[PDB]
Amino acid sequence: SMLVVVTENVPPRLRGRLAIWLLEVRAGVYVGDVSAKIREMIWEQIAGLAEEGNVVMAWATNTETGFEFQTFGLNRRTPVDLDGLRLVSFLPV
């Protein structure tokens, strides 16, 4: 499944590891086609090595909306479900 990871202000360690498995099409944007197992290992790496940072991971799925995403870090938006549709929720500014 196509996988995209977008990082903001994460340690060099995380950046270096994403670049081991994914193509860095812009600094802090990583794209690849990986299996679900690989994807989950990549999420582990994100939760472990991102600290002050914001991360979002999105991947293609066979669902009504056709993709799924999960976020990490401060001010992360939250993935929500509306009658089977994937949407996003966030805090008032």
């Binding site: 009504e64 929500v80 509306l82 009658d83 089977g84 549709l85 949407l87 996003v88 929720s89 966030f90 805090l91 008032p92 500014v93």
Partner: protein, 271 residues
Amino acid sequence: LPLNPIPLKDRVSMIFLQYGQIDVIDGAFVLIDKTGIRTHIPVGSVACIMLEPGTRVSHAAVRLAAQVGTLLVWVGEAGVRVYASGQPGGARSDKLLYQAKLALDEDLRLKVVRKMFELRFGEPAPARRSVEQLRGIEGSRVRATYALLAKQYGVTWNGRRYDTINQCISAATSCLYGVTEAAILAAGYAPAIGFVHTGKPLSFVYDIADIIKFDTVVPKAFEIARRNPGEPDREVRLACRDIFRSSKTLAKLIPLIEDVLAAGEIQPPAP
């Protein structure tokens, strides 16, 4: 750079909003929870947004919805249409007057109605029938098909009301009626100007939707009615969204409207 509505086929057919307020904040179409949480809805990528009682809509929202060509539908019990808002009228006069001449001239009217018959029933109408006469034939066939479906799903049938089954049918066709109004407006025609149904608020909607109504949507109303689940409405709506996607309903709606109108053999407006 101009903002152009994407085709209805390239959108999610419909979204029902149960609670909250609809608004635009920092340039994003947004549903606001009573707690204050913001949920982003990509408005341009949905064909129909339904508003159940207990929803508030802002000026900026109606404005944006209209500009991206997303119909807003206020709904009530069984999802019945209460109201709708969008761009006021069709921008092209040639399209309206074209539809209007077809509907006013009784010979042209019949030519159109015959095509509707042919499309709905897979065979030509009996020759030399008036529009009124054809509606009788159509009526009998429908009641027949209503009955036949009841036998195939084990649902008790006492007729159609216009009753778990009767609630399901209305919900199912209300969903079809919604995206059909959406399709009629997107094509630039008047929902109010019809051929079979007349003087009624959305005559042309009923005209178009009733043609494809029984293919999948109404049979689905029975499959769910046989089940007799606690909340029939939410289940039917989800099913219609499924049907519309797999049947490619929205993509099939545009040429259906033009063909029905083209049957009058009056020259159509240019693309």
